[PDB]
Amino acid sequence: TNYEYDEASETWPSFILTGLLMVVGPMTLLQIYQFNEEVFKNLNEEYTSDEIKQFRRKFNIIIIVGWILVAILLQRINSNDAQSTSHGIALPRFLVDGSASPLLVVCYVALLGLILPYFVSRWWARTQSYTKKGIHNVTASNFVSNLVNYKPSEIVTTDLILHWLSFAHEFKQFFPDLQPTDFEKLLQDHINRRDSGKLNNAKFRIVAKCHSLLHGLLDIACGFRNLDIALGAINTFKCIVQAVPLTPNCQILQLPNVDKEHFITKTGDIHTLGKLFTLEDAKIGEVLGIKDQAKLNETLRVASHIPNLKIIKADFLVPGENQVTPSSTPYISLKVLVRSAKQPLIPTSLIPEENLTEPQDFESQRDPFAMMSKQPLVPYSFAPFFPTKRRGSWCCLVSSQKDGKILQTPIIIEKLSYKNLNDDKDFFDKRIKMDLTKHEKFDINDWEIGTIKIPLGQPAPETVGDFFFRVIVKSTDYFTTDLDITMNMKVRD
Amino acid sequence: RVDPLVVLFLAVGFIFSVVALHVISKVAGKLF
Amino acid sequence: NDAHDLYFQIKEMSENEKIHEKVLKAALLNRGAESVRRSLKLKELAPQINLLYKNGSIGEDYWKRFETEVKLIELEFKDTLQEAERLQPGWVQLFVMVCKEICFNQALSRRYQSILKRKEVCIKEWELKINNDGRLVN
Amino acid sequence: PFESFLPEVIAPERKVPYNQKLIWTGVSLLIFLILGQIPLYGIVDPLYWLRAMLASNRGTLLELGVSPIITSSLIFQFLQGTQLLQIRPESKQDRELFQIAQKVCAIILILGQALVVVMTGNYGAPLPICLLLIFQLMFASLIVMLLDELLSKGYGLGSGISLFIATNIAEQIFWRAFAPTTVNSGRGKEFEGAVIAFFHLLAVRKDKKRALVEAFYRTNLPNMFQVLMTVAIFLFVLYLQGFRYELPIRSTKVRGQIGIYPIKLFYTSNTPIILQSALTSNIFLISQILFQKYPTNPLIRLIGVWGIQMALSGLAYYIQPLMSLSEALLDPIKTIVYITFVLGSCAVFSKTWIEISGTSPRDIAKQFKDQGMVINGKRETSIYRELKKIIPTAAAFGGATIGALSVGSDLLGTLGSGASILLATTTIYGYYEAAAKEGGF
Amino acid sequence: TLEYNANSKLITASDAVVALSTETNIDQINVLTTSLIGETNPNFTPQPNEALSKMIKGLFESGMKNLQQKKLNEALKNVSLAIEMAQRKRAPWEAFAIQLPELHFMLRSKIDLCLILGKHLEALQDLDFLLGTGLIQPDVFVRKADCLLKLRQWEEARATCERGLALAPEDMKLRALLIETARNLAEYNG
Amino acid sequence: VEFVREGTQFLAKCKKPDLKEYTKIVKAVGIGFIAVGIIGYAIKLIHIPIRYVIV
């Protein structure tokens, strides 16, 4: 109707009090009301360079102001003095009839014409330039274009994938002054642990951004059903994470304090962690050439705490049935044993056969991944040269064995138990060689067997026979012992 | 043929032209 | 990234330097083989590209650009066939098959020639100490 | 079938993520709401029920609202239900022709409704001003139908009509609570909002033991008791939405597909209450019209008599909803007959709706036969016999509990009608469950 | 930029810095020109040449005869010369389905001879080419795993053994090779 | 009278949502409903002085 504004400043104070209380109260209420051991979260900062710490570092009052405003308006109202129906409004009078009568309408039309359409258009153009994976559209376009006119003759190495990554469009936004060749030089300096001198704050940024780029490249390569590029991508990710050039004997060069000029020239037979641990604790230090017990303990604790895998039972499963049937949708079930490079081999027969079988219950066979989703996350990696802090990650990708083409997008698992690695069960050493299975502290039920399940994404063939597959589970932070297995589905009907 | 941003632009332009016509007819009486 | 402009460069050189006629037919066969290879590659990549696009990992303009390249390749191949007919009378039904053959032949030739470089890549990657005669000296 | 070249928005080729969908839903809602607050320019019978139900308000660019779209949709729904359209799913050209015919009839009915409301409305008989006023609402109608098409194409969480209805319902609810408007009738200025006047009386009256009970009853204006009651009923209806029967299913064509076929308690939630409301609306409309036209008649006095307005001493008197507990304790027979009728109505409505809309247990059994899915521990020829033991009882009980919730809300005096609250809750719960089963933040 | 010779009719790029694809196309065009120079008929048929095949067969027989003479060194040189001649002096417009089998049949003998002599890396590369160009047979995986184990590469050795077993798991040699690779890798690790 | 029996049997056979799911449901729906209502209220409130000044 014909409203009557507050011309005595007696009604809008109460309305403002209500509007402010309804927003402060819940905030005050909320404020009043409100698993996997990581051994590296401590030793990481002890070996990370200070130039990296500086990079990692550099790159509620609403309640109080609302309360004091409520107090001010309450005192203001308390200082105030105060048939047909007369309608009115609560807003003050000068807000509509004073000298600022056109100010409100011009502010409103401005907020409608400039702030809304311009910001909506900018947000739309930004959210359209991005892919669902998390990379820019130009970067994905470059990756696809480079994978299309890719001669199968050239063998993929780390240098070629770095050359590809240097064409990332997101690096130009970070630094419009640098060129792709500069990015290649920076990444080479990072891998070979070479000092850029002045562009260190750019090298750190590009290395930090390389993660999502390599994941996008891996996804695209698996999409094109190409295996060499995927393997090279995971190996390059390992190389960039650990800041160590890809060599035959690199699992031992990823250690914190080793001198290559001494190690390579001295020994030529120690290639993996196990052959290293075969030697005594003093011979290890004498070979590595560090001769510092206070510092040898650190590298011994690191090299005895990165995870090596080993399968216990690998086979296909169909949820709700017992055998692989023609034109059915099975999934891949893996039983891995996360062990350190120090523990001897535990025979398969010692497993109590209870941890390997799958419970056949409707709540369980409705979604076989709910049981996997209960495992704790993986700890922080030992990446002394990677700028940010990362959690480990395991990339499980499956290919066929008829021709050798990847037949699904790569699955990236993150949940796993490293309980078999804690410093409590250290009596299980390879050097004791006294059948440590028959030990007074050995109990086969204490070793936890993590599980990994990969949905197949493609149905079984309509024919009848054995069809072979290949499952690869490579690490993404260390140079550990990976998985390279073959499995065949015995379609029998 | 038509994009969503085209629709938003048409709607906002229509509302803007309506409010402009209103304010013009209002100021016409005050000026003349 | 193609030999399409190379044949045009040869053609423009023909009218000025009085080049031989056979080199023109050679460049023509080369362009035809390249067109055949690119058409086959696009035909084999269409399903995977479409799958990646429907999955939402390739962008929206790239699908349009690819669909445009599909018909651009056909236009280029038809123009190459027309040029071949212009150059030699009644020389079309043989042109397609000789291009189809030289495509795979030069593909195999490149794949074989690449092993001369591929041989040292693995040496550098695995730090092998190989003396003469290709034997290992550990 | 015909030839047609008219503008339309194109659907995206790829799935739209959750955030891009949510932001677009919010922006479309903002535009649709701003369209409902700006009045026309050339301006110089009140039906609050239709304007409150069909998302329309008089004197604004949104006076037509979603009524023109909903009319065409209902017309084509009836034409498809009567099997006269003989729509065949084996061809997509017929579907596209039907979808474009939807728009080409919606626009013509928009023209007709606009012309009739202009030539008959109280705006005034006295040409360029009339043409400009016509074009304003014309362009507004095209804008709102295009926005609905956008929200339905995939850029939005769901349909547009139901969303706008739910938003208008929520807005009526919020306005019945935080209304800044005041009324001065002898005693003084008093806010027309619950919380606003509540805090105002708590502050300025300087008598807590009296101001609290004075602001809690408020026999004339909404109070704290109504707010507490409506939020409690909202929470209870929420808790009632999770009720469902999960029967185990498996596949026989492609072995190894284990899932659950959920059967909620509110099987056809939105339909029975809205059909009952429309029926009662037409009923009392006809009763009032015939009582105003005919002064007195035996059958007119039998069907309904109106007095102090309200109906009394007639059949239309029994169908009227109860105001509060006082009218409940006044005539217990009236309460009994009204409750029995309002429950049986929703019951038979749920039954006929699940039988007509193609979700009968026979149709569901046929659909299982098509998909090949079977029950876990039963046979093939038993799925229909089992669905007959679940679907009808579930539908009847859902209709009954919906009726009971509506009448309880209407009796206990909520801020809004129970039908509106339930409709908004269902419309939002649908979006929630869709975003859950699809996967989004 | 590019130059055109007169007496040789071979196109060479006059630029000092030239791209790789351009170089490949230039060499291919040179090959096409030098083949069209020899082939006289304008409407050439994809039917392969006869005298060229006879010369290739003669060189191959000269290489193979050295096996009966127990001369294992010059046989490799003769086989390599025959393969290079068949790869060079054959015009690309000859039949693919006829040039491919001859190359495979000669390269298999070259593989066996190079493996017998003691050269392992060239053998591994030849097997890699032959396996990537479209021949997947259990007669190749055995030699590939043998070469990989000889040049100390155990992971790919086990991978190739598994890929071979995934085709004919009834083989009596692939299982032994897998067992040997497993033992060697167990020593490599423990 | 058997109607309430069938109803209570159907209810006892249904799956009632527990606390951990009910809290997520109520949180999501409350955020949605309140974000709708506050936007509607702001739109209906701000346009009153605009409607008075302009018109």
From Swiss-Prot, chain A:
Domain SEC63 stretches: 109-413
Entry keyword set: Chaperone, Endoplasmic reticulum, Membrane, Nucleus, Phosphoprotein, Protein transport, Repeat, Transmembrane, Transmembrane helix, Transport
Cellular compartments per GO CC: endoplasmic reticulum; mitochondrion; nuclear inner membrane; rough endoplasmic reticulum membrane; Sec62/Sec63 complex; translocon complex
Ranges facing Lumenal side: 1-11
Phosphoserine modification, residue list: 393
PTM text: Phosphotylated by casein kinase II.
Keyword Repeat: yes
InterPro entries in the cross-refs: DnaJ_domain, DnaJ_domain_CS, Ig_E-set, J_dom_sf, Sec63-dom
Residue numbers on the Cytoplasmic membrane side: 121-493
Any one GO MF annotation of this record: protein transmembrane transporter activity
Subcellular location per the Swiss-Prot or TrEMBL entry: Endoplasmic reticulum membrane; Nucleus membrane; Nucleus inner membrane
UniProt topology in membrane: Multi-pass membrane protein
Region (2 X 11 AA repeats) residue spans: 342-384
General remark: Present with 17700 molecules/cell in log phase SD medium.
Quaternary structure and partners: Component of the heterotetrameric Sec62/63complex composed of SEC62, SEC63, SEC66 and SEC72. The Sec62/63 complex associates with the Sec61 complex to form the Sec complex. SEC63 interacts in its phosphorylated form with SEC62. May physically associate with KAR2 in the endoplasmic reticulum and this interaction may be regulated by ATP hydrolysis. Part of a complex consisting of KAR2, SEC63, SEC66 and SEC72.
Annotated protein name in UniProt: Protein translocation protein SEC63
Species of origin: Saccharomyces cerevisiae (strain ATCC 204508 / S288c)
Swiss-Prot record, chain B:
Known partners and oligomeric status: Component of the heterotrimeric Sec61 complex, which is composed of SSH1, SBH1 and SSS1. Presumably three to four Sec61 heterotrimers assemble into an oligomeric ring with a central aqueous pore. In cotranslational ER import, the pore diameter varies from 9-15 A in a ribosome-free resting state to 40-60 A in a functional state when associated with the ribosome. The Sec61 complex is part of a channel-forming translocon complex whose composition seem to change dependent upon different functional states.
Residues passing through the membrane, by range: 4-24
Protein's recorded name: Protein transport protein SBH1
Compartmental location: Endoplasmic reticulum membrane
The species this protein was found in: Saccharomyces cerevisiae (strain ATCC 204508 / S288c)
Its biological purpose: Part of the Sec61 complex, which is the major component of a channel-forming translocon complex that mediates protein translocation across the endoplasmic reticulum (ER). The functional states of the translocon complex include co- and post-translational ER import, cotranslational membrane protein integration and retrograde transport of misfolded proteins out of the ER. In the cotranslational pathway, ribosomes synthesizing presecretory proteins are targeted to the translocon by the cytosolic signal recognition particle (SRP) and its ER-localized receptor.
Family, per entry: Belongs to the SEC61-beta family.
Portion held of the full protein: 51 to 82 of 82
From Swiss-Prot, chain C:
Keywords, sorted A to Z: Endoplasmic reticulum, Glycoprotein, Membrane, Protein transport, Signal-anchor, Transmembrane, Transmembrane helix, Transport
Acetylation found in the keyword field: no
Location relative to the cell: Endoplasmic reticulum membrane
Membrane topology: Single-pass type II membrane protein
Signal peptide stretch: none
Cellular component annotations (GO), alphabetically ordered: cell periphery; endoplasmic reticulum; endoplasmic reticulum membrane; rough endoplasmic reticulum membrane; Sec62/Sec63 complex; translocon complex
BP-aspect Gene Ontology terms: filamentous growth; post-translational protein targeting to membrane, translocation
Residue intervals on the Cytoplasmic side: 1-138
Family: To S.pombe SpBC409.21.
General remark: Present with 7820 molecules/cell in log phase SD medium.
Name this polypeptide is given: Translocation protein SEC66
Annotated organism of origin: Saccharomyces cerevisiae (strain ATCC 204508 / S288c)
Curated annotation (Swiss-Prot), chain E:
Protein name, per record: Translocation protein SEC72
Keywords: Cytoplasm, Protein transport, Transport
Cellular localization per UniProt: Cytoplasm
Cited function: Acts as a non-essential component of the Sec62/63 complex which is involved in SRP-independent post-translational translocation across the endoplasmic reticulum (ER) and functions together with the Sec61 complex and KAR2 in a channel-forming translocon complex. A cycle of assembly and disassembly of Sec62/63 complex from SEC61 may govern the activity of the translocon.
Presence of keyword Transport: yes
Binding partners and assembly: Component of the heterotetrameric Sec62/63complex composed of SEC62, SEC63, SEC71 and SEC72. The Sec62/63 complex associates with the Sec61 complex to form the Sec complex. May interact with protein YLR301W. Part of a complex consisting of KAR2, SEC63, SEC66 and SEC72.
Recorded GO CC terms: endoplasmic reticulum; rough endoplasmic reticulum membrane; Sec62/Sec63 complex; translocon complex
Misc. remarks from the entry: Present with 5290 molecules/cell in log phase SD medium.
Gene Ontology BP term (one): post-translational protein targeting to membrane, translocation
Principal location: cytoplasm
Highest taxon, organism lineage: Eukaryota
GO MF annotation: an example: protein transmembrane transporter activity
Organism, scientific name: Saccharomyces cerevisiae (strain ATCC 204508 / S288c)
InterPro entries: TPR-like_helical_dom_sf, TPR_rpt
